[PDB]
Amino acid sequence: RRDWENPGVTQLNRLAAHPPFASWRNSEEARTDRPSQQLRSLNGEWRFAWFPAPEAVPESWLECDLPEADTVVVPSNWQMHGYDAPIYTNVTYPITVNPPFVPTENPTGCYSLTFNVDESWLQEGQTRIIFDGVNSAFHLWCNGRWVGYGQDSRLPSEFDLSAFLRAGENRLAVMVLRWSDGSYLEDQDMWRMSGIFRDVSLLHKPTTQISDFHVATRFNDDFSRAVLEAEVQMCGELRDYLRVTVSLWQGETQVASGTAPFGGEIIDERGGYADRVTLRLNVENPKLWSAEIPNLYRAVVELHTADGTLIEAEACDVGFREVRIENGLLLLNGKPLLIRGVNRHEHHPLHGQVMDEQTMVQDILLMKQNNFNAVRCSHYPNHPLWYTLCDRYGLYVVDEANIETHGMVPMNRLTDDPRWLPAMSERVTRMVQRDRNHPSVIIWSLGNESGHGANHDALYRWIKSVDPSRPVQYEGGGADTTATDIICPMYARVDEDQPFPAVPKWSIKKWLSLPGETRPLILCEYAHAMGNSLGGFAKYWQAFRQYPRLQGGFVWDWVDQSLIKYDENGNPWSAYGGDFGDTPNDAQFCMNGLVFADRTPHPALTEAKHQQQFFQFRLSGQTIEVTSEYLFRHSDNELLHWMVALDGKPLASGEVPLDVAPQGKQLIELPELPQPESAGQLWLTVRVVQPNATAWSEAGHISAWQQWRLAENLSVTLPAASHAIPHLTTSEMDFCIELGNKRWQFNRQSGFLSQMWIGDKKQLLTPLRDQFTRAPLDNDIGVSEATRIDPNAWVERWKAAGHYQAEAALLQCTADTLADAVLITTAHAWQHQGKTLFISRKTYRIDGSGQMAITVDVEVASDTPHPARIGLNCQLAQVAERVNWLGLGPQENYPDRLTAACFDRWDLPLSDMYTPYVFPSENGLRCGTRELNYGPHQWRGDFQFNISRYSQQQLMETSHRHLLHAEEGTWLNIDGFHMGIGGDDSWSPSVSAEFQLSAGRYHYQLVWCQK
Amino acid sequence: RRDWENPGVTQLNRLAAHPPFASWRNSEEARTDRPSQQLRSLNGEWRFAWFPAPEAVPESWLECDLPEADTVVVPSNWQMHGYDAPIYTNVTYPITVNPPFVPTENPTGCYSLTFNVDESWLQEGQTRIIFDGVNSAFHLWCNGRWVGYGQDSRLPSEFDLSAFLRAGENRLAVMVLRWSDGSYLEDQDMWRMSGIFRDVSLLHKPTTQISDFHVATRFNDDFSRAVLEAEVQMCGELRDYLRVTVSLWQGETQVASGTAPFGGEIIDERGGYADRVTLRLNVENPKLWSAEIPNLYRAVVELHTADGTLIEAEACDVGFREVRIENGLLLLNGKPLLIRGVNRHEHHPLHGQVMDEQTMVQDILLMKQNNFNAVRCSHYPNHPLWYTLCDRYGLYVVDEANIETHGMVPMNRLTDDPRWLPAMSERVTRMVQRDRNHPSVIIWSLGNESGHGANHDALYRWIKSVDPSRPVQYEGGGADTTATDIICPMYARVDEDQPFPAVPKWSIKKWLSLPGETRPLILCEYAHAMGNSLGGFAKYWQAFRQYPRLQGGFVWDWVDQSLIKYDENGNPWSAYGGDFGDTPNDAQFCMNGLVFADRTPHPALTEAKHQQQFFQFRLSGQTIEVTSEYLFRHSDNELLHWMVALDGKPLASGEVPLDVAPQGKQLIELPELPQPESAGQLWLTVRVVQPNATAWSEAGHISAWQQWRLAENLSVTLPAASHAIPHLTTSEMDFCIELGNKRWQFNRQSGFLSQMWIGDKKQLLTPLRDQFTRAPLDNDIGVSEATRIDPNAWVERWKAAGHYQAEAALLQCTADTLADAVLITTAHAWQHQGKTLFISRKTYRIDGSGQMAITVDVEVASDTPHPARIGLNCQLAQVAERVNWLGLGPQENYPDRLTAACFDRWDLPLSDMYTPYVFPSENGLRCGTRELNYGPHQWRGDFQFNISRYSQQQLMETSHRHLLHAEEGTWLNIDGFHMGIGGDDSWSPSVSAEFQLSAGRYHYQLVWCQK
Ligand SMILES: [Mg+2]
Ligand SMILES: [Mg+2]
Ligand SMILES: [Mg+2]
Ligand SMILES: [Mg+2]
Ligand SMILES: [Mg+2]
Ligand SMILES: [Mg+2]
Ligand code: NA
Ligand code: NA
Ligand code: NA
Ligand code: NA
Ligand code: NA
Ligand code: NA
Ligand code: NA
Ligand code: NA
Helix, strand or coil: CCHHHCCCCCEECCCCCCCCCCCECCHHHHHHCCCCCCEEECCEEEEEEEECCHHHCCCHHHHCCCCCCEEEEECCCCCCCCCCCCEEECCCCCCCCCCCCCCCCCCEEEEEEEEEECHHHHHCCEEEEEECCCECEEEEEECCEEEEEEECCCCCEEEECCCCCCCEEEEEEEEEECCCHHHHHECCCEEECCECCCCEEEEEECCCEEEEEEEEEEECCCCCEEEEEEEEEEECCCCCCEEEEEEEEECCEEEEEEEECCCCCEEECCEECCCEEEEEEEEECCCEECCCCECCEEEEEEEEECCCCEEEEEEEEECECCEEEECCEEEECCEECCEEEEECCCCECCCECCCCHHHHHHHHHHHHHCCCCEEECCCCCCCHHHHHHHHHHCCEEEEECCCECCCCCCCCCCCCCHHHHHHHHHHHHHHHHHHCCCCCEEEEECCCCCCCCHHHHHHHHHHHHHCCCCCEECCCCCCCCCCCCCECCECCCCCCCECCCCCCECCHHHHHCCCCCCCCEEEEEECCCCCCCCCCHHHHHHHHHHCCCEEEEEECCCECCCEEEECCCCCEEEECCCCCCCCCCCHHHHCCCCECCCCCECCHHHHHHHHCCCEEEEEECCEEEEEECCCCCCCCCCEEEEEEEECCEEEEEEEEECCCCCCCEEEEECCCCCCCCCCEEEEEEEEEEECCCCCCCCCCEEEEEEEEEEEEECCCCCCCCCCCCCEEEECCCEEEEEECCEEEEEECCCCCEEEEEECCEECEEEEEEEECCCCCCHHHHCCCCCCCCCCCCHHHHHHHHCCCCCEEEEEEEEEEEECCEEEEEEEEEEEECCEEEEEEEEEEEEECCCCEEEEEEEEECCCCCCCCEEEEEEEECCCCCEEEEEEEECCCCECCECCCCEEEEEEEEHHHHCCCCCCCCCCCCEEEEEEEEECCEEEEEEEEEEEECCCHHHHHHCCCHHHCCCCCCEEEEEEEEECCCCCCCCCCCCCCHHHCCCCCEEEEEEEEEEC | CCHHHCCCCCEECCCCCCCCCCCECCHHHHHCCCCCCCEEECCEEEEEEEECCHHHCCCHHHHCCCCCCEEEEECCCCCCCCCCCCEEECCCCCCCCCCCCCCCCCCEEEEEEEEEECCHHHHCCEEEEEECCCECEEEEEECCEEEEEEECCCCCEEEECCCCCCCEEEEEEEEEECCCHHHHHECCCEEECCECCCCEEEEEECCCEEEEEEEEEEECCCCCEEEEEEEEEEECCCCCCEEEEEEEEECCEEEEEEEECCCCCEEECCEECCCEEEEEEEEECCCEECCCCECCEEEEEEEEECCCCEEEEEEEEECECCEEEECCEEEECCEECCEEEEECCCCECCCECCCCHHHHHHHHHHHHHCCCCEEECCCCCCCHHHHHHHHHHCCEEEEECCCECCCCCCCCCCCCCHHHHHHHHHHHHHHHHHHCCCCCEEEEECCCCCCCCHHHHHHHHHHHHHCCCCCEECCCCCCCCCCCCCECCECCCCCCCECCCCCCECCHHHHHCCCCCCCCEEEEEECCCCCCCCCCHHHHHHHHHHCCCEEEEEECCCECCCEEEECCCCCEEEECCCCCCCCCCCHHHHCCCCECCCCCECCHHHHHHHHCCCEEEEEECCEEEEEECCCCCCCCCCEEEEEEEECCEEEEEEEEECCCCCCCEEEEECCCCCCCCCCEEEEEEEEEEECCCCCCCCCCEEEEEEEEEEEEECCCCCCCCCCCCCEEEECCCEEEEEECCEEEEEECCCCCEEEEEECCEECEEEEEEEECCCCCCHHHHCCCCCCCCCCCCHHHHHHHHCCCCCEEEEEEEEEEECCCEEEEEEEEEEEECCEEEEEEEEEEEEECCCCEEEEEEEEECCCCCCCCEEEEEEEECCCCCEEEEEEEECCCCECCECCCCEEEEEEEEHHHHCCCCCCCCCCCCEEEEEEEEECCEEEEEEEEEEEECCCHHHHHHCCCHHHCCCCCCEEEEEEEEECCCCCCCCCCCCCCHHHCCCCCEEEEEEEEEEC
């Protein structure tokens, strides 16, 4: 039948979808959510055999184990076990586009399990098997007999095995196909894997059972009263003695309960549902659920007989909350939300797409610790435990249907085709049927990047009809179609319009007020965090805070989809597209996370934490105004620590308890701050501390901070005249300057400081020269390739202009003796094919104190692409252990990504001044630095800098971080100016104009001396 | 696989749906809609074999003809050939309700055909087979190889046979299943049949072909300009030299043309449709389409090469019209419609559900001739020729999806189930894909009686998305749900509310103004024409005309679903539910038409024609005001004939040409009418005549009429005193009255006139006695049964009260002699178990002229159900050929159904005074009669009457008209009063209060004499 090549057949003998079941036969266990003897896990060691196609599978496999098979753990993706290669492709389908057909050579995974089934399970009731996730399609056999078929890799497929099981030994045979017609709806930008990657289990239900139940909570105007409504459905034989009791619990206290026989209200001319009943419980002053305070109740659903005999019980956590859009605003419990979200794929560097509780908990803790309050299930229903955790820890969730047809041309070719409506409807409807009782789910999503088709409108309406408690959104076809309650664009910029034909991405501020538009706007994806990114992040948040209808968005994305591979010595390294022989592929594009695959944070995470803070501050005189952005909670676990320091030197500090009502303000009067004697800039730093630990954070957790420049005293005191005076020796090839054991050498041919001596020790390995380029960031490269150049990409414009090829041409080099110092003057012209790109004019002034003052003045041709940087660089001979500096830090920060950085005195080990981005590029910069110390060296001024054992050249010639090798000495890049990194997206220039080096003329000065 | 027991599989290898194709290879042929050499018909003689189940079919059948098979005509329903019984069931499913399963004993029809195929059809292109209708599911094999499967009995299933055919002879094998999961969605109230009941054909298309095309027409505010937009889609190899040309023709005049290469506009990020193109043609002053004037243009779609070489051409008729709902009104070309519709099932008394052109044309002509302008396809897509005819003859059509699950409990059990969405969507989407280019289709319907489920909302939105040119309606779940643009109730009454729980049927006038309601209201079904019905029809039309938002409705229904059977002697008769051994069944309920199965009109049709007239009249003095209800046409084929008559005697007449603009008025001044000498009532009668013949009517066709009472001269002249005097001979047992050769005999024991003589010739066969009952009409019976009594039905209330058992008890009987006459006085009491139901007091006065004046005064107990009638009856010995009367006629008319009847002198053969309703009951009544003549008899007064060879008793004891037998003499029923017949529905009392005999006391007088 080749059911895997027919969108008309998405399953065979599959049971109806429903909320999580456990079939407890004890009410107390259901109330407390303890394990159930009726729900058994079949996870563990299974037998596995790989085949090139289903036609290659031997019939004997259905009867008994294949001796060639191996024993492997399940759940798992067989690519992670090495049976075949995982494929990383973004848009382009991994298979030829010829729906509904797939390749004849279709990798087939044959799984099998011999397990015991107790007689008692077969004597009565129904025994079903549940596959929470099988990628992408599969046939099931039990004890040699065919049971069924199923599609949709991200939702559970259940089958009744009651008639196939025998007391004792039983054997399951599961033939999993890598490709199927279902694959046409699973073109998400991620690794393409397959296998039984989610839990497998057995559930025993009585013949007369609870087959489904829906929980809803409605409120009065002030939420002081609520009505919990529970619709319960049954299957089996109806008897008048049957009953349903729904009890609601607050901890161990029962707050309400309702009991009734089956038989719903009349719905039409033929009557009502005899096999259904709806219980309604009144709740006074319910404790409301939110990501701020995840208050939860326990709802226990008991199916029993009138005389009190329990048949079975099911249950779920209940969160009393209302989600609604009113007057253009998305409200939660009557208050306008501000979504601090992030998109999160289910990815593990070692296990592939198999999820586990520990990894899920780790992600949630890091998310809340970094001020996120929402997550989008990009782009498919998640592992069931995820929603349970989000309910309890408190995170707003966008549950998304597993539908993405990005590679189609046009994108809506299938979604607008009525023949594909059946396949699509199952992916939407079964998701809703499964997750509708989770309070954390506040919005439904029709899928991702599948254009806009009539199928979307039909399914949008279906959800509005079955579940009016949640808004429905969908970005396809322009982000504001008739299939979405929320304007949810991806990568729309703050102020800049991108007028693409048919599907323009308007500035978000402009989008809101388009003629006739009234909906709220929340980006489903924004701030592409690929590599050294997140430049301009603060621009989004300033807009979110100023515009009521701009209610946030979800960053793209949480974690890099890099995979682990090993070298000959067994050392693991991070791999991406193409590293498994997979081709075609989209290389680095699978890595766009705020954290590395092992959950180690990228520098950008801190920028997100800061901009997403829940407390805002303003300074006026001695008064600090604290404003709360919390909607429901008071600041009852917050303390404000303040500190004043003069150039890193603390002068005063203290702490004040925070008592701010949600949306409220608090005024904190700072004590009389003493005036510092020494000259310099006084800085005020405040930070909110959480004294007590929480379920998601440790005691002392810092949730927010802010800095302000206070009084400044300009230094007007002249340095004590050094009785000493430098000496200038002159040869026809050099200009030397000595002062004690110190010597400065200037090559009169190149015009650069080629060497410095402190005794008999050389200080430089490479001359001090100007630098106007940087090892290209992912944002500088975009989608440009060696065989497919994107002339519009920054890196391509720099290359074409000759910025990387430019040769320094000496125009002038002179030296002069002053009453107390030696003056060296140089002038260079960087050209490319007769074109003068830059002109650098410098003056070096060495005085009796051994301090070298370097003054640089650069001219940039107005018609050459703006340079990535304007600074100097050299390879120092020294290799010290620490790097001490007075400037923005402690983490890596760039011009358009430095709001989170604080000004102070920082000291770190050299290795921390390098950011291990899987794909190497310019990195580790620190801006607004007034003083830098390394080894015996000290540089003073106002510059940006990065320092490491890797040259810009090696960084731009290496594709993977594990291939980098520490060079001799230490490479130092000191810039007077540095271009922004951008990030609004990573496939087109995204560096805002104000962060481009377009002034035409630049000036900066440095002072080099021995610390 | 048992695909017929899986709603997940509704087809296998079926081609996509699309508008009618013919694949012309000559553009002129396509323009003229002449037959296409590429579209062949396979209709004719096929081989057929019946089996009790699919498992009983021999494998050899796939290879060669079964010698036991018979040769039968196709299309056809095998029940009509006698292979098994057709089943008539209304709501209750004909099979056990256990979705998706059907009976194991599943009648299976094995059809096969050996046919030839020109080799040229196989040398190039694609050859497909098309089954326009197969009831209910089927598998297809070609030359022994399995081709595909298909469901949905009312839409075409197409399969590509290119790879299965050979030159010369080929053999098709079609296994048709009577029951399938599809049957759960086909529970319409009609005969349940099966087989290949619609055309079968072969279509040849080129490899590069037109695969679909959509035509739309948009207009400016005053419809003086239009833009015809044609989207054309292709399949096959794309080449830049391919072109599509769309030409629009008005007769033999090409009004517009457009040519372009393939390649649509950009729709999303992935581009646009390279395999599509949209042509836009401007049309100035387009001739608009409407049911009033069906103006049509011809659109020819040519797929060709740049060098002008034609590849293929398709085409369709185009009607320029706009359908939209604005401010609560349904508008057609900017004007509010008034729907004069009727529901029409595809039914033929001999061929079952097989439709043919002649029958379709006959129905359309009769419909338009009786002032109908709209038809509803109850309850499934019709034979494709139907829409073509409606486009050309001019009728508004409601195209309805083949979805009805009436027998489910509750009614929406399947429609609210997401697992049934796939099956449902195919029935809606494939209908739209097939009929969207027909101008006659102005509204889409989601189906019928399937409650209201989320599936309905999803499909409602799908249509609004793919075709915004037509409103969508659906009655299920309350008639005003979120799945309907029109409030479309069935059997909602005019003034009376029917507050059923959940799905009330409010008075239509009240429905319109319910809080928040703004939609237009058009009944999808009203005025149940079952048997002697349509009482109260005028009440609906008075409301439709007074309320702008009450825009009409569709009568239920067009033709009786009676079937022909032959007795032993091979004589045909009309049969209904149960007559084929089918059980359970719903008997007479399959007959609700305005016309008999053979299209002979029921009396009610004329009432509909009259109330649905397009011209309204008012009389003021000598002025007749004519108002036109036409929206677009002028009365350019209308003449007004007027006539004045005194008691049937014409005095003056004439004709005036009608010149009325749509919605306009015309004043016609009647000449000075001469005053009649004789006493009596002058009557004015006007009628609109169509001098010229049309496509739907003959010259002289009468489209409307109206009557008014003019001056009346009461007779004050006393009759010439007769020179004779009757004699009274009194005996113990009798009261005799003699006059010449005439004798009157009053039985003193019974108190009734038992005999009258004229010589030796007896006048009566049965005494003249009071009558207060009638042979129950279908509306009197409702759903009451012998084994399932409905105590609320009129017939049951009459029976329970003893109205049919009541015995006359003589209270007084006297004789008197007057100066010029003899006076007989009687008094009777009709009782039942000690209860006096009625009291009848009479006086008979016989004078010298031989005239007998009868005065009757009846008392009706206020606590007994109101009587069906109050009159006298007797069996006359005479049997004359003609019946002459001065009263309402000429056709049967009742108190609540007599507006169409005219007052005049009528003369008909006795047989026409009897209405052959298949189910016998009271019939043939004529109201407002002042004089009745039959044989030598003449009755004068003001009464209602019926006269025939069938007694009320025989009529109420006979189930079928063919079992009736003319009794001796003639039965005469003369009523002073008669109860209304009702009809708002036929399952609950529907006779309006004003037509119930509830006065308590009645009086009427008659005069019996010789003509
Ligand atoms: Mg499939
Ligand atoms: Mg994508
Ligand atoms: Mg700051
Ligand atoms: Mg089926
Ligand atoms: Mg029905
Ligand atoms: Mg009249
Ligand atoms: Na906002
Ligand atoms: Na990506
Ligand atoms: Na606090
Ligand atoms: Na690099
Ligand atoms: Na009206
Ligand atoms: Na009926
Ligand atoms: Na005329
Ligand atoms: Na009868």
